[PDB]
Amino acid sequence: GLMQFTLPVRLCKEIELFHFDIGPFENMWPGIFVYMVHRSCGTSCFELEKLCRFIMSVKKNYRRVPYHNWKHAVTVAHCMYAILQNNHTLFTDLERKGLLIACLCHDLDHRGFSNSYLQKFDHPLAALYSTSTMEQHHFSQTVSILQLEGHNIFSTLSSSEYEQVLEIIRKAIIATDLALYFGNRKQLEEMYQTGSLNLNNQSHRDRVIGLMMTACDLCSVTKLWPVTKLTANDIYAEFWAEGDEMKKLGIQPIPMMDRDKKDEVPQGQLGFYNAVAIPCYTTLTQILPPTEPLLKACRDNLSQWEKVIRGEE
Numbered sequence: 001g002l003m004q005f006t007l008p009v010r011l012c013k014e015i016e017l018f019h020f021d022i023g024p025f026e027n028m029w030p031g032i033f034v035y036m037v038h039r040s041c042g043t044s045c046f047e048l049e050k051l052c053r054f055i056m057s058v059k060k061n062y063r064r065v066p067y068h069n070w071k072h073a074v075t076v077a078h079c080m081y082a083i084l085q086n087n088h089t090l091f092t093d094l095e096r097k098g099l100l101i102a103c104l105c106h107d108l109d110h111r112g113f114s115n116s117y118l119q120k121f122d123h124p125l126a127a128l129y130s131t132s133t134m135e136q137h138h139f140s141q142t143v144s145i146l147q148l149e150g151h152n153i154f155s156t157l158s159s160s161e162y163e164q165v166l167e168i169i170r171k172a173i174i175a176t177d178l179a180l181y182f183g184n185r186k187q188l189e190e191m192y193q194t195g196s197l198n199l200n201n202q203s204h205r206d207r208v209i210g211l212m213m214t215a216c217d218l219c220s221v222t223k224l225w226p227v228t229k230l231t232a233n234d235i236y237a238e239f240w241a242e243g244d245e246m247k248k249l250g251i252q253p254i255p256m257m258d259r260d261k262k263d264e265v266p267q268g269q270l271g272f273y274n275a276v277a278i279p280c281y282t283t284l285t286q287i288l289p290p291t292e293p294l295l296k297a298c299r300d301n302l303s304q305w306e307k308v309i310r311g312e313e
């Protein structure tokens with residue numbers, strides 16, 4: 001109750017900002033998350049003994065992969081923290097509880113392979129779950145860890161509030177399947193443009209939480225250039241290994257995953273910023289004006305990739 005978390009002065013200040021990097025000290029990330037839960041949620045939201053045991057079991061069940069790792073889990077939770085603190089009054093106590101947890105768990109037990117590589121490999125998870133394969137697996141892993149003893153961080157919720165929050169978490173995790181983002185954004189865009197968007201319509205809230213989840217998931221493209229550039233290497237290390245594994249199956253991968261096609265990466269980031277990132281953060285800023293800084297940072301990084309092509313770096 002009276003045990004607050006504090007950070008150093010630089011972190012205490014820079015953590016409120018969207019472009020905050022959680023830094024290379026693994027053992028500080030758990031406190032960074034508790035700090036964000038206590039301020040976003042309150043110091044009463046979670047039994048600290050249970051939250052801390054929950055946080056360490058989630059850490060335990062991320063894998064040592066170049067990108068979809070424990071650092072990603074906390075990075076995506078920090079972006080969701082920033083959005084919640086910039087839209088203080090728009091969200092319920094349960095949504096703020098749920099979403100930060102949704103973020104920390106969204107990629108549990110990720111192996112570094114897309115849903116497509118699971119399908120072509122004929123992985124058992126693709127037989128159990130035909131669409132959003134990894135994402136249904138991530139939500140499965142989250143429920144499992146919540147059911148471990150001393151780990152039920154929601155224990156003080158009523159049967160119905162418990163089922164609301166798991167529903168919020170289930171939909172939030174499923175939304176991180178990018179293949180679902182395109183439609184979700186196009187429907188948010190139209191609803192905004194025809195003035196029919198309504199945050200009292202639960203179906204509408206669901207969609208808007210959807211877009212937040214994509215925005216937090218992609219938030220490595222909203223960092224300062226040196227962080228974005230260095231994280232791009234981690235994401236491509238996974239893509240190249242998946243492409244290698246595609247060749248192992250007898251399938252020539254798309255270029256973005258062909259490690260023999262590095263020369264095409266700057267031009268591929270252009271497409272990616274144009275087709276995915278800028279639209280995502282444009283529609284978010286339209287629905288949530290205080291998230292403008294993510295669009296700005298995303299635009300700066302696009303501008304930086306054009307400079308790479310022009311051989312100015």
Ligand SMILES: CN(C[C@H](O)CO)C(=O)c1nn(C)cc1NC(=O)c1nc(C2CC2)ccc1Nc1cncnc1
Nearest residue numbers: 178218220221228231232235256268269271272275276
């Ligand atoms: C074009 N589509 C989407 C397809 O239509 C469907 O998958 C792409 O996914 C795509 N195409 N290219 C050439 C790159 C792509 N993705 C990425 O670079 C990329 N992806 C993801 C998640 C959603 C997978 C997170 C970050 C990404 N980059 C990045 C840049 N800097 C720092 N950190 C990360």
Ligand SMILES: [Mg+2]
Nearest residue numbers: 106107176177
């Ligand atoms: Mg994912």
Ligand SMILES: [Zn+2]
Nearest residue numbers: 072106107217
């Ligand atoms: Zn993710």
